């Protein structure tokens, strides 16, 4: 992944997204187009 | 966890997940902190 | 592979890969494609 | 090892495994330390 691409799509390192809630992740995600 | 956490955790039902291949499964379980 | 291409497509050694349990070795194989 | 744990650890099913050659049922069982 690396946080740079995290940083460039969620706005957050990979550690941080890393630690949101479940379902915020899979929120992010549904949002950014990405499943 | 019961069945209803599990939804609550994991995002789909515990049978959902018992039919994904058992290598997704210890992944999933893995990604959290419930195995 | 040869253990160059192993390195390049997997990012690790065969004997790191090794060490993976089996789980996350049958997840990258899956993630890269591979038997 | 079980049948099913057989299978958890080593990928395959006994009588898989079986139709290996013995060098290399002799490389697994080394491979996952099952001695």
């Known amino acids: 992944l ?3 691409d995290f ?6 390192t990979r550690s941080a997204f890393a630690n949101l809630p479940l379902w915020k992740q899979x929120h992010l995600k549904k949002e950014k187009g990405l499943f």
């Open 2 to 4: 690396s946080d740079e």
């Open 7 to 12: 940083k460039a799509v969620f706005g957050m």
